[PDB]
Amino acid sequence: NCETSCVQQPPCFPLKIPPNDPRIKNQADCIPFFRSCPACPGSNITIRNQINALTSFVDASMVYGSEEPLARNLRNMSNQLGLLAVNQRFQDNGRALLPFDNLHDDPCLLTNRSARIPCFLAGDTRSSEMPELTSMHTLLLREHNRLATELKSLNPRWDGERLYQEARKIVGAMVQIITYRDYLPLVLGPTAMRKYLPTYRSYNDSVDPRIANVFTNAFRYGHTLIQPFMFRLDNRYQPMEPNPRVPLSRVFFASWRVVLEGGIDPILRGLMATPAKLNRQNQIAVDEIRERLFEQVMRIGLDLPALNMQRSRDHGLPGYNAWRRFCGLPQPETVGQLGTVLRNLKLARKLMEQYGTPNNIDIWMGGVSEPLKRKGRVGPLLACIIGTQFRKLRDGDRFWWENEGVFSMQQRQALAQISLPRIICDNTGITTVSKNNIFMSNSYPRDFVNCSTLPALNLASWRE
Amino acid sequence: CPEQDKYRTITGMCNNRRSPTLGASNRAFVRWLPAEYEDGFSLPYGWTPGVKRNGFPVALARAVSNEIVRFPTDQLTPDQERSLMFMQWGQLLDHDLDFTPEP
Ligand code: HEM
Ligand SMILES: Nc1cc(OCc2cc(-c3cccc(F)c3)ccc2Cl)c2[nH]nnc2n1
Ligand SMILES: *[C@@H]1O[C@H](CO)[C@@H](O)[C@H](O)[C@H]1NC(C)=O
Ligand SMILES: [Ca+2]
Ligand SMILES: [Cl-]
Ligand SMILES: [Cl-]
């Protein structure tokens, strides 16, 4: 009874309220928390471990699904066109929307009672979490269908399965290319990129491709990039009235905002032409996530950073120093030493007041506290955990896009030409997109170009 | 586990021929360090009142949040060298990699 009870009984591990809290004034209340499902339930032999319900590979499983029945249901099986099913009730300016899902306790319906717009159905259960995410999901759904259509005109004798597969294979490589070429270097910075992600050579069958338990927490560094608003922009990259700056605590699960407030174009424009939030040691994460997470679909607004630290404890993750020691980094033991590591004594004092020792600092908290690496957005600890994980996913993937035999030399040269700005051009009404790199480009019109200047993915090498 | 294959399985099964479940869905995460529990095998730190972690009381995740995470909204520093798309791709990416189920 985690959603409503405050009694600490399995599977509940509620977050207790401290005195003089800025929001929750009743100390008998709590922040709801369900302990993650144990891999081996009831065991008095194994050390509690958690499950990854997804494929560790960067294979667009958020589009296709990580389970066979879900994956069948996501496909359009009415024909041999090899397409993904789309919404049969609504469209975004003639363009496809993700199908609706059949949830028992649908949180999306709670975001706007009168609208009656349910959650979307994607490869991953979190598609409707924020409309910016729904937009990315809707974009890749269109990209698959665009590819399957192009392939049918190229190879008319190819059946639905072959069309589905070949387009899935392209979408997966596109996700890999964007991640490794454009995203990761900006997360890590040049040095951590050379250290953890040296030039790909070939597939190594002795590389464990699994997600480490620590990564589930460490990759939450992204919480420090979250802006308190959802920004929408019109055709001319100008604030879309009414509601151009909707608060984040009014967009969670608001699937209706995609369906009834202009579709994906204003959201994608907002994502491209708005800066991200910068992580600063005195400005870690916004109150829209720290105080009002899921405010309108729950009894109480959650605290995301607190959940991150409680989750790491639920997962039995060692503290800051043990991760520093694992990464080959010095382990500070005093306030002064920690002040040196963080290049900030003020923060070190606050951290010592809470934990008493750097050994006890929860991974997320320690990680996000570290000064950022030159031209990157993480410190040395998270750079190590993150970099280590992504190398394993690359070198341990038999279907890695560059692996000999996965694609042809020609197909590889055609895929090398893809970009996220181009995917936007091909699947939306947007005619002016971010200059490469899309992750750096954030100012309109300085960093923006016409779609005409961008060459398309040439599928010629896919002819049979 | 087929000797010849052109595509990925939906579950990630068979990507690694020697250990076919590696990277596949609905499997236990790998550990880079042994787990640290109150009882050594299941109870998280902070579960039992008065039970210290490595010599010190366990701080409330909410207190850490309040004292170190909290900042006034209006002072937010925008990133001059990153777009909101940088945040969004990170979340989309995360959703291709991991999901920790709950009861
Ligand atoms: C657009 C905003 C984002 C959210 C809203 C959001 C929310 C969550 C929540 C509620 C969780 C579960 C928390 C818990 O421990 O109980 C969550 C987990 C994870 N995130 Fe969050 N997140 C948003 C945005 C991001 C971004 C931009 C990320 C990375 C760049 C990011 C990552 C993650 C990860 C890895 C997790 C854990 C995933 C898992 O279940 O295995 N998030 N986030
Ligand atoms: N482990 C997780 C879990 C998440 O969200 C769970 C979720 C909540 C509700 C939900 C329903 C009703 C009320 C409520 F407050 C939440 C319904 C579906 C889902 Cl999927 C995440 N969001 N982003 N990353 C995430 N990682
Ligand atoms: C299946 O494809 C046809 C042709 O594109 C379309 O008319 C139909 O709506 C599709 N069904 C779904 C569920 O997407
Ligand atoms: Ca995956
Ligand atoms: Cl539908
Ligand atoms: Cl681990």
XYZ file of C-alpha atoms and ligand atoms in Angstrom:
653
model
C 0.000 0.000 0.000
C 2.961 2.370 -0.902
C 0.899 4.993 -2.713
C -1.084 5.745 0.462
C 0.561 4.186 3.601
C 3.497 5.621 5.653
C 4.198 2.389 7.554
C 7.595 0.894 6.532
C 6.608 -2.719 5.599
C 7.729 -4.578 2.403
C 7.641 -3.551 -0.469
C 7.380 0.035 0.893
C 10.400 2.129 1.776
C 8.850 5.628 2.245
C 10.979 8.748 2.475
C 10.469 10.278 5.995
C 9.899 14.052 6.382
C 12.553 16.160 8.157
C 11.618 18.993 10.631
C 11.098 22.467 9.074
C 10.610 21.044 5.545
C 9.839 23.866 2.983
C 6.689 22.078 1.655
C 5.592 19.014 3.672
C 4.774 20.513 7.084
C 3.289 17.271 8.483
C 6.061 14.948 9.691
C 3.606 11.946 9.938
C 3.307 12.156 6.106
C 6.014 10.845 3.704
C 7.038 10.591 0.054
C 5.781 7.248 -1.421
C 8.377 4.673 -2.457
C 8.160 1.077 -3.744
C 11.350 -0.983 -3.444
C 12.483 -2.202 -6.884
C 11.436 -5.814 -7.684
C 14.122 -8.250 -6.373
C 15.714 -10.534 -9.043
C 15.373 -13.469 -6.648
C 12.270 -13.020 -4.423
C 12.295 -14.267 -0.807
C 15.963 -15.473 -0.906
C 18.030 -16.009 2.263
C 21.098 -16.961 0.043
C 21.686 -14.343 -2.666
C 22.510 -10.660 -2.175
C 19.422 -8.644 -3.280
C 19.707 -7.430 -6.888
C 17.373 -5.612 -9.246
C 16.032 -6.331 -12.763
C 16.447 -4.516 -16.079
C 13.088 -4.987 -17.901
C 14.752 -3.674 -21.198
C 17.447 -4.632 -23.702
C 20.766 -3.069 -22.582
C 21.696 -2.491 -26.273
C 21.182 0.815 -28.071
C 18.737 -0.845 -30.512
C 15.773 1.625 -30.316
C 13.905 -0.726 -27.886
C 11.984 2.385 -26.692
C 10.389 2.316 -30.210
C 10.089 -1.473 -30.870
C 9.736 -3.037 -27.394
C 11.913 -5.445 -25.336
C 9.205 -8.200 -25.129
C 7.760 -10.247 -28.113
C 3.973 -9.705 -27.422
C 4.393 -5.897 -26.967
C 6.538 -5.786 -30.118
C 3.748 -7.587 -32.138
C 1.095 -5.125 -30.807
C 3.238 -2.148 -31.851
C 3.268 -3.304 -35.498
C 0.583 -2.633 -38.176
C -0.386 -6.233 -39.131
C -3.333 -5.224 -41.404
C -0.954 -5.465 -44.423
C 2.550 -6.418 -45.735
C 3.810 -2.764 -45.571
C 6.100 -3.388 -42.519
C 4.775 -0.366 -40.598
C 4.274 0.547 -36.940
C 0.639 1.005 -35.781
C -0.446 4.629 -35.424
C -3.291 6.418 -33.579
C -6.705 5.732 -35.230
C -8.551 8.513 -33.329
C -6.189 11.511 -33.949
C -3.481 13.024 -36.217
C -0.978 15.936 -35.917
C -1.605 18.049 -39.105
C -2.143 14.891 -41.197
C 0.965 13.329 -39.564
C 0.875 10.184 -37.365
C 0.563 10.050 -33.573
C 1.552 7.109 -31.273
C -1.365 4.680 -30.553
C -3.235 5.056 -27.229
C -2.682 2.454 -24.455
C -5.208 0.543 -22.298
C -4.010 1.323 -18.732
C -6.095 0.306 -15.731
C -5.048 3.377 -13.638
C -4.191 5.800 -16.536
C -2.356 8.894 -15.120
C -2.732 10.904 -18.383
C -6.546 11.173 -18.009
C -5.914 12.901 -14.608
C -3.853 15.757 -16.203
C -6.976 17.183 -17.910
C -10.230 15.526 -16.820
C -12.468 17.047 -19.567
C -10.082 16.287 -22.474
C -10.227 12.452 -21.815
C -6.888 11.817 -23.630
C -5.202 8.568 -22.410
C -1.486 7.558 -22.320
C 0.361 6.647 -25.488
C 1.597 3.144 -26.347
C 5.305 2.946 -27.286
C 8.224 0.431 -26.993
C 8.806 1.778 -23.489
C 6.127 2.354 -20.805
C 7.391 5.893 -20.069
C 6.479 7.505 -23.529
C 3.755 9.838 -22.092
C 5.895 10.956 -19.043
C 6.603 14.429 -20.598
C 5.374 15.776 -24.017
C 9.005 16.478 -25.077
C 9.623 12.692 -24.695
C 6.326 11.793 -26.461
C 7.567 14.054 -29.322
C 10.872 12.106 -29.659
C 8.896 8.794 -29.565
C 6.371 10.138 -32.185
C 9.285 11.313 -34.340
C 11.030 7.875 -34.437
C 7.614 6.164 -35.066
C 7.260 8.374 -38.203
C 10.934 7.775 -39.139
C 10.391 3.974 -39.142
C 7.215 4.245 -41.342
C 8.988 6.755 -43.675
C 11.869 4.213 -44.115
C 9.572 1.181 -44.579
C 7.646 3.119 -47.336
C 10.860 4.165 -49.155
C 12.130 0.525 -48.969
C 8.840 -0.837 -50.423
C 9.157 1.473 -53.507
C 12.824 0.342 -53.828
C 12.215 -3.408 -53.263
C 8.519 -4.117 -54.095
C 8.879 -7.893 -53.600
C 9.997 -7.453 -49.917
C 7.352 -8.647 -47.391
C 6.124 -6.844 -44.200
C 8.627 -8.675 -41.925
C 11.599 -7.777 -44.169
C 10.381 -4.140 -44.456
C 9.830 -3.949 -40.669
C 13.249 -5.485 -39.951
C 15.305 -3.420 -42.420
C 13.719 -0.114 -41.195
C 14.254 -1.216 -37.508
C 17.933 -1.944 -38.335
C 18.297 1.636 -39.812
C 16.480 3.307 -36.839
C 18.788 1.428 -34.379
C 21.963 2.561 -36.235
C 20.564 6.173 -36.339
C 20.129 6.067 -32.502
C 23.715 4.643 -32.184
C 25.213 7.315 -34.543
C 23.461 10.276 -32.787
C 24.476 8.895 -29.350
C 28.117 8.147 -30.088
C 28.924 10.861 -32.604
C 26.855 13.779 -31.244
C 25.546 13.130 -27.718
C 28.285 11.316 -25.698
C 31.247 13.673 -26.625
C 29.225 16.615 -25.176
C 28.368 14.628 -22.002
C 31.981 13.535 -21.322
C 34.203 16.209 -22.870
C 37.246 15.461 -25.112
C 39.581 13.760 -22.549
C 36.971 11.359 -21.014
C 35.870 10.589 -24.577
C 39.458 9.514 -25.531
C 39.937 7.672 -22.184
C 36.590 5.761 -22.074
C 35.504 5.677 -25.735
C 38.646 5.149 -27.929
C 38.086 4.616 -31.676
C 35.919 1.530 -32.392
C 37.937 -1.442 -33.769
C 35.557 -4.476 -33.789
C 32.990 -6.537 -31.853
C 34.485 -8.264 -28.769
C 32.441 -11.287 -27.576
C 34.157 -11.133 -24.124
C 32.701 -7.651 -23.349
C 29.758 -7.819 -20.907
C 27.000 -5.683 -22.549
C 24.767 -5.541 -19.398
C 23.705 -2.361 -17.599
C 25.466 -2.059 -14.245
C 23.200 -1.409 -11.268
C 25.214 1.879 -10.570
C 24.461 3.217 -14.128
C 20.653 3.338 -13.405
C 21.494 5.958 -10.801
C 24.573 7.624 -12.340
C 22.796 8.324 -15.684
C 20.229 10.365 -13.697
C 22.828 13.250 -13.953
C 20.356 14.408 -16.666
C 18.003 15.618 -13.872
C 20.377 18.570 -13.414
C 19.671 19.618 -17.151
C 15.836 19.810 -16.699
C 14.271 23.277 -17.329
C 11.220 24.250 -15.165
C 9.075 24.831 -18.263
C 7.920 23.186 -21.454
C 8.714 25.708 -24.209
C 6.617 25.770 -27.378
C 7.547 27.849 -30.522
C 5.484 28.749 -33.668
C 6.446 28.541 -37.433
C 8.680 31.677 -36.995
C 10.497 30.317 -33.800
C 8.563 32.780 -31.618
C 6.653 32.075 -28.346
C 3.411 30.224 -29.169
C 0.519 32.047 -27.369
C -1.401 31.062 -25.254
C 0.870 29.013 -22.900
C 4.405 29.388 -24.514
C 6.099 28.611 -21.116
C 3.870 25.956 -19.398
C 5.241 24.819 -15.905
C 6.807 21.317 -15.712
C 4.327 20.287 -12.924
C 1.454 20.761 -15.455
C 3.036 18.723 -18.366
C 3.828 15.378 -16.609
C 1.659 12.749 -18.313
C -0.207 15.540 -20.169
C -0.713 13.471 -23.378
C -3.660 15.812 -24.206
C -1.128 18.668 -24.710
C 0.305 16.726 -27.755
C -3.215 15.773 -29.123
C -5.092 19.112 -28.328
C -2.365 21.848 -28.248
C -0.589 21.778 -31.594
C 1.176 18.425 -31.806
C 4.929 17.755 -31.877
C 6.307 20.704 -34.029
C 6.064 23.474 -31.308
C 7.681 21.080 -28.739
C 10.564 20.054 -31.083
C 11.169 23.778 -31.983
C 11.210 24.543 -28.228
C 13.736 21.709 -27.648
C 16.019 22.990 -30.452
C 15.896 26.752 -29.720
C 15.897 26.816 -25.894
C 19.091 26.317 -23.810
C 19.283 23.383 -21.381
C 19.657 24.167 -17.639
C 23.272 24.243 -16.547
C 24.363 22.165 -13.528
C 25.898 24.464 -10.918
C 26.969 23.400 -7.438
C 24.477 25.879 -5.847
C 21.829 25.226 -8.532
C 21.570 21.412 -8.751
C 17.948 20.606 -9.772
C 14.671 22.606 -10.137
C 11.702 22.589 -7.731
C 9.303 21.455 -10.513
C 11.068 18.053 -10.033
C 12.228 18.491 -6.393
C 8.782 19.586 -5.066
C 6.127 19.040 -7.706
C 7.057 15.793 -9.561
C 3.766 14.128 -10.619
C 1.808 16.724 -8.488
C -1.452 16.442 -10.484
C -1.640 12.576 -10.728
C -0.866 11.739 -7.144
C -1.730 12.379 -3.526
C 1.542 14.397 -3.077
C 4.209 15.853 -5.361
C 7.364 13.744 -5.372
C 11.009 14.866 -4.890
C 13.036 13.357 -7.790
C 16.614 13.910 -6.354
C 15.459 12.418 -2.995
C 14.007 9.403 -4.918
C 17.392 9.046 -6.706
C 19.228 8.796 -3.298
C 16.560 6.530 -1.718
C 16.728 4.309 -4.901
C 20.491 3.965 -4.611
C 19.998 2.786 -0.958
C 17.177 0.365 -2.049
C 19.671 -0.936 -4.701
C 22.396 -1.318 -2.043
C 24.811 0.876 -3.971
C 28.148 1.636 -2.198
C 28.745 5.327 -1.339
C 30.816 8.041 -3.100
C 34.364 6.962 -1.976
C 33.864 3.283 -2.975
C 32.883 4.511 -6.476
C 35.859 6.961 -6.518
C 38.145 3.981 -5.513
C 36.545 1.780 -8.265
C 37.229 4.545 -10.878
C 40.851 4.997 -9.692
C 40.195 8.451 -8.207
C 41.389 9.827 -4.810
C 38.930 9.246 -1.930
C 38.710 12.374 0.279
C 38.186 11.651 3.979
C 37.902 15.276 5.438
C 35.963 18.484 4.687
C 39.151 20.185 3.394
C 40.030 17.228 1.117
C 36.428 17.082 -0.216
C 36.529 20.871 -0.732
C 39.626 20.266 -2.931
C 37.931 17.409 -4.902
C 34.759 19.521 -5.473
C 36.804 22.832 -5.910
C 34.145 24.109 -3.440
C 34.484 24.128 0.375
C 30.949 25.545 0.867
C 29.435 22.479 -0.872
C 31.880 20.119 0.989
C 30.694 21.566 4.364
C 26.998 21.078 3.415
C 27.800 17.492 2.277
C 29.744 16.795 5.513
C 26.836 18.136 7.633
C 24.464 15.688 5.927
C 26.701 12.566 5.674
C 29.493 12.925 8.249
C 31.930 11.218 5.860
C 32.514 11.263 2.096
C 32.093 7.405 2.296
C 28.372 7.838 2.933
C 27.611 10.350 0.119
C 24.948 8.754 -2.139
C 26.314 8.164 -5.714
C 23.919 10.564 -7.570
C 24.570 13.381 -4.989
C 28.370 12.895 -5.024
C 28.439 12.538 -8.782
C 26.335 15.633 -9.628
C 28.333 17.706 -7.023
C 31.676 17.294 -8.858
C 32.908 20.206 -11.036
C 32.236 19.552 -14.748
C 34.996 18.371 -17.072
C 36.245 20.792 -19.801
C 33.611 20.842 -22.661
C 31.535 18.151 -20.887
C 28.518 18.090 -18.567
C 29.685 15.504 -15.901
C 32.563 15.348 -13.386
C 35.342 12.653 -13.352
C 33.270 10.041 -11.365
C 30.149 10.105 -13.587
C 32.441 10.412 -16.654
C 33.990 7.104 -15.564
C 30.720 5.244 -14.730
C 28.949 6.623 -17.864
C 31.945 6.206 -20.240
C 32.641 2.654 -18.958
C 28.975 1.678 -19.522
C 28.761 3.089 -23.086
C 32.019 1.386 -24.126
C 30.610 -1.957 -22.982
C 27.353 -1.331 -24.998
C 29.429 -0.542 -28.153
C 32.221 -3.196 -27.982
C 29.788 -5.827 -26.645
C 27.108 -5.373 -29.330
C 27.260 -7.979 -32.145
C 24.828 -5.719 -34.122
C 26.855 -2.523 -33.600
C 26.387 -0.422 -36.773
C 30.138 -0.404 -37.670
C 30.653 -4.148 -36.952
C 31.852 -6.061 -40.122
C 28.876 -7.852 -41.667
C 26.115 -5.759 -39.947
C 25.925 -3.283 -42.915
C 27.782 -2.948 -46.285
C 30.633 -0.412 -46.754
C 28.139 1.623 -48.910
C 25.284 1.331 -46.322
C 27.826 2.479 -43.646
C 28.775 5.543 -45.745
C 25.050 6.339 -46.300
C 24.284 6.087 -42.526
C 27.331 8.300 -41.698
C 25.230 11.110 -43.311
C 22.289 10.950 -40.849
C 21.479 13.740 -38.333
C 18.695 14.419 -35.787
C 17.917 17.812 -37.548
C 17.325 15.815 -40.826
C 14.992 13.254 -39.066
C 12.938 16.300 -37.883
C 12.799 17.676 -41.552
C 11.602 14.342 -42.969
C 8.882 13.695 -40.385
C 7.477 17.115 -39.374
C 6.225 20.447 -40.786
C 9.475 22.091 -39.641
C 11.484 23.690 -42.495
C 14.184 25.394 -40.333
C 16.291 23.211 -37.993
C 19.446 23.251 -35.765
C 22.905 23.423 -37.333
C 24.931 20.313 -36.473
C 25.651 19.753 -33.541
C 21.917 19.855 -32.516
C 22.999 19.328 -28.851
C 25.103 22.517 -28.874
C 22.886 24.660 -31.218
C 20.241 26.535 -29.099
C 19.932 30.116 -30.491
C 17.470 31.144 -33.227
C 18.356 32.268 -35.838
C 22.209 32.110 -35.206
C 22.415 28.291 -35.062
C 19.546 27.480 -37.479
C 19.500 26.470 -41.226
C 16.960 25.547 -43.964
C 16.023 21.840 -44.450
C 16.968 22.181 -48.164
C 20.684 22.597 -47.183
C 20.547 19.160 -45.451
C 21.071 16.063 -47.656
C 18.748 13.090 -46.984
C 19.643 9.467 -46.094
C 20.300 7.792 -49.439
C 18.752 4.290 -49.398
C 20.290 3.322 -52.838
C 22.618 0.698 -51.183
C 19.455 -1.139 -49.887
C 18.328 -2.092 -53.488
C 18.106 -5.854 -54.221
C 20.497 -19.817 -30.568
C 20.682 -19.745 -34.425
C 24.068 -20.130 -36.245
C 22.919 -17.624 -38.916
C 20.928 -14.386 -38.268
C 20.486 -11.003 -40.044
C 18.616 -9.102 -37.280
C 18.406 -8.450 -33.538
C 15.877 -10.319 -31.425
C 13.294 -8.113 -29.688
C 14.534 -9.342 -26.259
C 18.232 -9.032 -26.982
C 18.485 -12.836 -26.652
C 21.303 -14.365 -28.747
C 23.319 -11.144 -29.261
C 26.087 -12.815 -27.252
C 26.431 -16.369 -28.579
C 28.532 -17.691 -25.602
C 26.168 -16.152 -22.976
C 22.829 -15.597 -24.814
C 20.921 -13.668 -22.091
C 23.602 -10.930 -21.862
C 21.934 -7.615 -22.647
C 18.532 -9.326 -22.926
C 15.384 -7.947 -21.224
C 13.962 -9.117 -17.848
C 17.359 -10.131 -16.417
C 19.295 -9.047 -13.269
C 21.630 -6.062 -13.605
C 25.369 -6.728 -13.442
C 27.222 -5.388 -10.300
C 30.560 -3.541 -10.577
C 30.900 -3.564 -6.740
C 29.293 -5.871 -4.100
C 26.020 -4.504 -2.654
C 25.986 -2.659 0.729
C 22.886 -3.448 2.811
C 22.144 -2.966 6.530
C 21.875 -6.784 7.022
C 24.348 -7.446 4.201
C 21.825 -9.079 1.873
C 18.494 -7.169 1.545
C 17.704 -4.243 3.929
C 18.640 -0.762 2.583
C 20.587 1.760 4.696
C 18.081 3.955 6.531
C 15.638 1.085 7.076
C 16.350 0.489 10.812
C 16.362 3.549 13.186
C 19.704 3.918 14.974
C 21.582 1.641 12.520
C 24.572 3.720 11.310
C 26.405 3.403 7.968
C 30.210 3.200 8.210
C 30.294 5.107 11.559
C 27.600 7.701 10.888
C 23.816 8.214 11.044
C 22.006 7.834 7.685
C 20.758 11.240 6.423
C 17.145 11.486 5.157
C 17.163 11.645 1.290
C 14.590 14.486 1.667
C 16.938 16.423 4.068
C 19.881 16.039 1.609
C 17.526 17.291 -1.149
C 16.315 20.281 0.952
C 19.841 21.266 2.119
C 21.963 20.686 -0.978
C 19.724 20.260 -4.070
C 17.227 23.120 -3.433
C 17.852 26.502 -5.169
C 15.411 29.443 -5.985
C 13.848 28.851 -9.490
C 14.288 32.449 -10.788
C 18.178 32.203 -10.553
C 18.385 29.237 -13.005
C 21.513 29.482 -15.173
C 20.790 28.513 -18.822
C 23.538 26.592 -20.659
C 25.138 28.735 -23.385
C 26.536 25.616 -25.166
C 23.638 23.029 -24.975
C 19.976 22.900 -26.142
C 17.004 21.339 -24.247
C 17.271 18.615 -26.943
C 20.542 17.567 -25.115
C 18.460 16.805 -21.999
C 15.696 15.109 -24.040
C 17.908 12.772 -26.040
C 19.485 11.718 -22.700
C 16.047 10.702 -21.345
C 15.044 9.018 -24.655
C 18.466 7.217 -24.595
C 17.938 6.111 -20.990
C 14.622 4.554 -22.079
C 16.415 2.333 -24.653
C 18.834 1.144 -21.886
C 17.157 0.569 -18.551
C 13.880 0.231 -16.720
C 13.751 -0.989 -13.097
C 10.311 -2.603 -12.445
C 8.409 -2.060 -9.158
C 5.677 -4.226 -7.475
C 11.575 15.153 -18.518
C 11.906 14.831 -17.286
C 12.268 13.602 -16.568
C 11.496 13.045 -15.671
C 10.150 13.572 -15.234
C 12.190 11.967 -15.094
C 11.582 11.181 -14.082
C 12.191 10.123 -13.493
C 11.585 9.312 -12.513
C 10.305 9.476 -11.785
C 12.394 8.275 -12.354
C 12.150 7.089 -11.406
C 12.664 7.585 -10.025
C 12.841 6.527 -8.905
O 14.069 6.136 -8.525
O 11.901 6.030 -8.334
C 13.481 8.482 -13.237
C 14.494 7.620 -13.357
C 15.515 7.782 -14.269
N 15.810 8.860 -15.027
Fe 14.850 10.564 -14.985
N 13.448 11.853 -15.582
C 13.531 12.817 -16.548
C 14.640 13.109 -17.301
C 15.765 12.318 -17.269
C 16.903 12.568 -18.091
C 17.009 13.787 -18.984
C 17.807 11.491 -17.873
C 19.135 11.258 -18.435
C 19.798 12.117 -19.205
C 17.145 10.579 -16.955
C 17.584 9.314 -16.650
C 16.902 8.513 -15.742
C 17.309 7.162 -15.388
C 18.490 6.418 -15.841
C 16.482 6.733 -14.455
C 16.374 5.322 -13.855
C 15.754 4.419 -14.970
C 15.407 3.002 -14.549
O 14.197 2.729 -14.031
O 16.193 2.073 -14.671
N 15.953 11.136 -16.489
N 13.444 9.685 -13.880
N 11.548 3.748 -13.086
C 10.956 4.771 -13.744
C 9.608 5.074 -13.559
C 9.037 6.185 -14.155
O 7.684 6.411 -14.232
C 6.798 5.388 -13.746
C 5.371 5.597 -14.177
C 4.475 6.244 -13.321
C 3.088 6.113 -13.454
C 2.169 6.786 -12.495
C 0.792 6.554 -12.522
C -0.067 7.253 -11.683
C 0.423 8.222 -10.820
C 1.770 8.453 -10.824
F 2.260 9.447 -10.033
C 2.651 7.759 -11.616
C 2.603 5.382 -14.541
C 3.466 4.824 -15.462
C 4.829 4.938 -15.277
Cl 5.873 4.286 -16.488
C 9.866 7.037 -14.914
N 9.675 8.260 -15.644
N 10.789 8.551 -16.203
N 11.772 7.602 -15.898
C 11.187 6.629 -15.067
N 11.753 5.530 -14.536
C -2.223 0.176 -41.222
O -1.813 0.714 -42.487
C -2.851 1.294 -43.304
C -2.153 1.847 -44.523
O -1.148 2.784 -44.154
C -3.620 2.364 -42.528
O -4.712 2.861 -43.302
C -4.093 1.825 -41.177
O -4.676 2.877 -40.414
C -2.906 1.264 -40.397
N -3.319 0.782 -39.090
C -2.714 1.146 -37.947
C -3.303 0.588 -36.691
O -1.744 1.904 -37.932
Ca 17.522 -1.372 -25.866
Cl -5.883 4.038 -30.757
Cl 26.971 -1.918 -9.781
